[PDB]
Structures are given as C-alpha cells and as structure tokens.
Design a protein around this ligand. Sequence first.
Ligand SMILES: OC[C@H]1O[C@H](O[C@H]2[C@H](O)[C@@H](O)[C@@H](O)O[C@@H]2CO)[C@H](O)[C@@H](O)[C@@H]1O
Ligand SMILES: OC[C@H]1O[C@H](O[C@H]2[C@H](O)[C@@H](O)[C@@H](O)O[C@@H]2CO)[C@H](O)[C@@H](O)[C@@H]1O
Lengths: 437, 437
Amino acid sequence: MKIEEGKLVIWINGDKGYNGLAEVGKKFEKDTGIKVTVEHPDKLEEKFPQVAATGDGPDIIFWAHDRFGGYAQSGLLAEITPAAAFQDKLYPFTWDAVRYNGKLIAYPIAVEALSLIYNKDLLPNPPKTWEEIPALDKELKAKGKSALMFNLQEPYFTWPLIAADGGYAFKYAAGKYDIKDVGVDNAGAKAGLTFLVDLIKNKHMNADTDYSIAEAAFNKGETAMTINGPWAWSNIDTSAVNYGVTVLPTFKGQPSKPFVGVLSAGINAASPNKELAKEFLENYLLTDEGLEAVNKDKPLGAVALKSYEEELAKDPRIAATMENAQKGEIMPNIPQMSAFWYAVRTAVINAASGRQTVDAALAAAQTNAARRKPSWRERENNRRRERRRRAVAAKIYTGLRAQGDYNLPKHCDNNEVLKALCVEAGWVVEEDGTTYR
Amino acid sequence: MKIEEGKLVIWINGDKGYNGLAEVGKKFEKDTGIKVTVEHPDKLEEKFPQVAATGDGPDIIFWAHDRFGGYAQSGLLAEITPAAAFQDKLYPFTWDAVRYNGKLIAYPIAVEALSLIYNKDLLPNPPKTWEEIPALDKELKAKGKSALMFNLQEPYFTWPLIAADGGYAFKYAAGKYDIKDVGVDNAGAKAGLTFLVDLIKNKHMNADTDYSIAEAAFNKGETAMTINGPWAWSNIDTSAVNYGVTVLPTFKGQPSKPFVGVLSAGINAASPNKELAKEFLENYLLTDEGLEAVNKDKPLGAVALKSYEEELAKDPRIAATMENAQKGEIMPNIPQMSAFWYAVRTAVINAASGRQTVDAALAAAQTNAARRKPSWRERENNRRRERRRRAVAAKIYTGLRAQGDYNLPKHCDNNEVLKALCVEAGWVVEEDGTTYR
DNA sequence: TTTTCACGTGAAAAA
DNA sequence: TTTTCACGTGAAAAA
Ligand SMILES: OC[C@H]1O[C@H](O[C@H]2[C@H](O)[C@@H](O)[C@@H](O)O[C@@H]2CO)[C@H](O)[C@@H](O)[C@@H]1O
Ligand SMILES: OC[C@H]1O[C@H](O[C@H]2[C@H](O)[C@@H](O)[C@@H](O)O[C@@H]2CO)[C@H](O)[C@@H](O)[C@@H]1O
C-alpha cells in the first residue's frame, strides 16, 4: 500500500485494541472528514522496514519502542515535534523511551510489562518462586490440570527468567549501550534457560507451546498460571476464569526481570499526512476519552498520559504490572535490538526442542546478537569483486577456446580447456585434476 | 512436535470451529480417558508436509481435500479403511474427494463453496452481474460506503470470477486430470482477471485488501457485499448487520464458478494413535452431536454426514452455498494443486498491484502451475556435479602453485595462477583477462 | 578490515 | 533430458 493525501492508515499489532482504536478513528473522521483505517497485519514490525524504505506502508505504525531506533536509523520515521505543553502531559520516562540520537521519533502510548496471571479457583496462593513450579505441576497433573503455560515461541516471554540471575542484552555504561557487550551467554542466562529446558525435560511444559495455545489453556481453566501482558486481560474477563495478576516468581532468590516496552506510534516519513497524523495522535488518541476507547477494547497497561494513568493506576492489575516493570528494565531502542531478539528467539526455541544444548544455543546467540550487519556498500563491494573475478576468468577461457586450437570436443566445460592449456605448457593432469610436470 | 501414545493432537485452520471441535475432544476424553488438544497454527497446510516427512506433526490434520493428494504422494497419510457401514453414512461424492490412487486418504467432513454475502439494509436487491458493481459502488461511495470487499490475497476468492468465462486449473479428459494442460492463461481467465484489475484501477477495490480487512468492513457495515464461505456467518451473526447469502454474480452472462472444497481429516502416517484417531473421527466427530458442536461454533457448510445434512440443508444459507457449489467444480486433489495455487496467487497479487500486466502475470502463472518440481535425486545430482567440478579445478591449481615456480605474489587468487600458466604456454593475458597469442 | 573459494540452485543451451 | 556457468553471500584466512 501507499499513503494518500487526505486519509489515514494505521498499523497495530493484532493483540492490541484495534477495534477501540478504530472508534477513535471514526471520531477523527466525524470531526475533520478524514477517513482512518486501522489494520493489524501479521509481522507488521518486519513488514514496515521493508515497505517504508521506498515510501510504502502506513501513515502511522504502532509497536513497542524497542523497534523504533532501527526505523529511525534507516530514515523511516518523521521527527516528532510536540509543543512543550503537550510533552508535559506524558511521563518524562516514556518520552525517553522514544528518544533516539537526541530526537523524538514516536509518540509514547502506554507502558507494558509481563506479569504472572493465575487462576484463583485452582490456585488460591500463587507460587512465589520458579523453583516450586515442578512440584506444583505434579500435584495439579493428578487433577488433570497443569501448573503453567506461556508462549515459548517469542523470547519476550522467557526473557524475565533468563535475566533474573544475571542475563542481559547489551551492557549499559557511561550513558550508552555497548553493542559489543552482550550478556546472553553468562552464568545467569544459562541458569535461567536451563531451568526452562528442565521444565520441558521433566514434562511440566511443552516446547511447542505458543501464544494461542497458552491463552486457550488458561482461559479454558486447563492450566493454573500463564505469563502475559495487560492486553490479555479482556479475553480472560469474558472467560469463566476468576484470575489474579501478580508479581512474577523469583528465580534463585532474585526477581524475574521483564523487558519493559512502551507501545509507541511513529509517523511514516513518507506520509503526506504528517500534520493530520499529529492531530490524530495528540488531540484524539492521547486524550482521556481516546485512550479509554482503546483501553476498553484491550487494556493498554500503564498509559503515558498522566491524567488517565491517574485513573488506571487505581486498578490492582495495573499496580501489579508496574511492580513487575520496576523490577525489569526499559528496553533499549537501538538498531541492534532486532538482531538481539532474533538471536535469543533462535536460542530459546532450539534449546526447548533439544536441537541444541543450552550452552550451544546461548553461545551462538551471543555471537549472533553482537554481529554487525554488513552495510549495503559492503555487500555491493563483495558482489562486484566476484562478478569481476568471474569475468576475468571467462575472458581468458573465451580466448583460449577461440585461438587455442586445442582439439576439444564440440561441447566441454572450462576445466577441459584448462587441462588442454596445462598439457600445452608441459603439464599432465589426471582425471581428478591431480597435476604435475 | 511429536505424536505420542495415548494423546490426540489435531490441527485445524483458524477460520473453522476449533472451539466446538475441542468440545468434541473433551467428550472423547471423558468417555475414553484420551486427552485431545485442538490447535490452529498458521500456515498449517505448509507446515504439515515439512514436519510429517520426519515423523513430527499432529495426529490429525484438517484441511480442504485439495491438499491431501500431495501429502499422500509423499507418504504422509495413513490409509483410511472405514467399514462399509460407516462409508454408507457419508455422501458418495464426498468420499470421491478424498480418494487418491484408489485409496481413501482422509475422512470428508463438509462441503465448502463461496457465496455472495450482502448487507440487506444497505443493498436490499444485490446485483446479479459483476458488470454492474462499478456503478453500484459509485452510488454507494456518495453515502460513504463501498460496494464490495473480499480477500484479494488468496486466489481461492478470486478464482470464481477467473473461471467464469472459461479459466480452468487442470483440464479433465478421459477420466484424468492433465497436469500439463493448465487453463490459467486463456481468454476466459484473462477476461476475468482484467475485470478485477479494472475494479482496482477505477478505485472500486483496494489491491491490499485481505481476509481480515474485508471481514471487518462488511461486519461493521462499511461495505455492502463480501465473498466468503460458511465459516464466516458466525461473526456476521454477532454483528449488527442484516445479511443475505445468495448466488455469486455472473460475468459475461456466465455463472461464477467457485472451486468447491471438502474439509477433510487426515491421519498422520507417523501417528501411534491411528486407532484412537479413527474412533474419534468416526464415532465422535462424524455424528449428529459432534458436527453440531463444531457447526454451532463456525458453520461447516454442507456436511458429508447424511443424517445431519438433512437438518442443515434446510438453512437457506446452505441452499445458496450448494447452488454456488453446483455451478462450480470440486477441486482436484492431485499433488500439483499446491503449485497451481501458488502460481495463481502470484498472478493475482502482481496484476492487482500493477507490477505486471494481466497478460504477463497469467503467462508466468501458466508455466509456473505446470512446472515439474525436480526430484531430490535430480537436485543431488546437480549439487554433486558442481562439487566435483570445483574439486577438479582446485586440484589443478594446487598443483600449479606447488610445482609451477611461477613468479607469484605472496597472496594471489587462482586467476593469477591461470595467467602465469597462460604466459608459460605462450599467451598474453591483459588485465581484464583478454587473452591471445 | 579485505580477500579467497565454496556453495547449490537458476537461466540458458543443446539435444 | 543433461550440461554449463552465473550468481551473491558464508566460512576461513591474513592482516
Ligand atoms: O519476542 C520478541 C519481541 O518482544 C517484544 O514484543 C512484544 C511486544 O512488545 C508486546 O507488545 C506484545 O505484543 O508481545 C510481543 C511479543 O510477542 C518486542 O517489542 C519485539 O520487538 C520483539 O520482537
Ligand atoms: O487461496 C488458495 C487456497 O484455497 C483453498 O483454501 C481455502 C480453504 O479451502 C477454505 O477452507 C478457507 O479456509 O479458505 C481458504 C483460502 O484462504 C485451498 O483449499 C487451499 O489449498 C489453497 O491454498
């Protein structure tokens, strides 16, 4: 798709309140005559950098802030220039999450952290530690239930446990992240991922469990706990499950440390609707009534807007969300973040499946997360060097075939021309290429 | 994932009644003690042949019958051997859909055909012809609505119109499909795809419209018509939309000809639970109560089970589904069907997008849908040949470097060795490789 | 950092 | 059908 003057197209992930967001768009259209279409395509955070590089893609893209630095580094985002008055309405630290190289590159919407979600009827007293989950599962398995099910396909969900005893993504020092100091392969990271793999080995979890499988199992009353974010609460509300939201369990006596995301809205640099997008975000979405419409659809978490967060903070589930968030860390927004996430995703999936040992999976993840992506020009230099290497050899063989008079067959390969050349120069060449004088 | 004794795992597409099917699995568990897990992973029809070739995958896989011949040809499916008593319970033509090389390779469940779905309040008298939809849209756009929106990303939904004037997949003659006689590039197919592209060029449809975008627009009352199958009726019921289901429009005076699918359930050849899977399918799912539970979740269409279809056939929506199905054709189940579908998908997306002309897109689709996939042995033959060709050359250069005593630099490539060889044989080789005596 | 050669599949060609 | 060479990026090496 390409953006067109006079209409707004928004992309947002399918686990968020896109129907509530569309109601906001319908009000924007009611007051200004500008159509707003909300879409939730799959893998939007990978599609956006592919299409926006040439001016395609939506007017506005919603994702957690960790993806946005790479978008800005590629020039895909318009600089966000809210007046000081508007900036004041949002918590300072949410603006920090969307600051890249000194510029604001998105509007912050809401703060997301994972929490432990548990079925109060099956589990009145949720476990305080990861270590006691195996025995809790054994007791539940005898009732035809399980202890815990959560998405093992996305490393976001396993990261709180990997980070608990010391794993980290990029080390922060002297005011900046060191993209070369990755902590996915230290003792704490191994201890965390070993405990998860051990859960699978002992049949307390299944390696293939994904988002929809864990959500169905919890919301149908088949497992006593899951790990998820606020967006998941509305589907649990509609289910028959009486659930609670609480702090994640400790591991080796230390808090689980979820990576905290700030859902943010960036404006496509290629949009011809930049001013309409700013009006929609600042004056319709980032208002009490705006965030309420989206929040009523799927909870946003702790919104960046101070006036409405004063209402949402009253909610015990938000209090638990932010207890977990305080124990975690805000994600970096640096371009290297996507390479870090791909590396850890591969490591978790390969260790859970048994395709790699924990040490092997994390050793590769450390190397992959730190690997510098070759620039376009570096790839092009390499492409041209081999093109030229082939073109020089091809010219040599062309001239040998045309002037050699080598008594060759009608059809033969260049190895046979090379052989005839060798013998002409006084060499002997065996069938397998063994060559001597 | 791997199958394991005493447990049943089922894969079904996410637009079907998987919650209702899980209800049948829960009754199975109560009666026999066998746990049943229903999953709806993405792209399951592509994942299944990838994992089943090695013994992985689910116990049971649900898909339209057109995919199953390819699975059978690869040895992925157990032969289905129901007693005559049970075969008698399903319509003979549904069994024909799951017979491949003389053997039954799945249980038929239900017959699917696309119909025209229309908003009664927006459009009390739906159009009878494709040709009048442009002017209908113009009139509707003045009121802020649109005429028609349907999934343009999957060629299933566009095929009815492509086939209307004479497009076809594989020609049927003398009792067999001719895998080399593909009809995606004749005048009838060109005419139908041109009309569709013309719809986009005149702004009556959007090239990027997919399943969820079209579903949302119809169910929110923004478009007067959509094209979809029975599984979609349940979300329309829940909406505020008053809808009818009717015959697809004609094109150039001829009926739209949907490809008719038979939702079918195959048993993984690697499953250690083949007998339990037979019992689940024959005695729990393919009963009045089992199909009812699934149907109440998302309508199945015209079920293969005679006793329950006598009840369903009385729904005017099913009568319209079967009026469309009579005008269409049952899909082949031959292994080539997947190559046909990929080819047409690429043609529709490329023409709708403007990257290719309709003629250019359908020309490639014809060759693509007829292309014979090279065998494993053929690929390995080619791989080894190049391995061998490189090894011969490398041995030659190893011998020249070791015994040539050419005045070579410390580090140089094999082109520089070739050059020295040429000069020794009496040749002159310029920098770009131009070679002569 | 740049440089060499491996790698297996596609496009072109001859039959 | 088989055959040749192009193609660009990865593994290894030298610095
Ligand atoms: O799993 C890697 C993934 O983690 C985060 O994505 C979260 C997202 O922040 C949440 O809004 C929610 O949708 O769940 C996602 C995980 O499935 C990162 O934001 C993302 O970049 C990263 O790939
Ligand atoms: O679009 C190509 C696709 O068409 C059919 O898939 C249908 C399926 O039969 C229906 O049950 C429903 O789910 O919609 C699908 C289209 O998205 C073929 O059965 C399938 O093999 C083919 O790829």
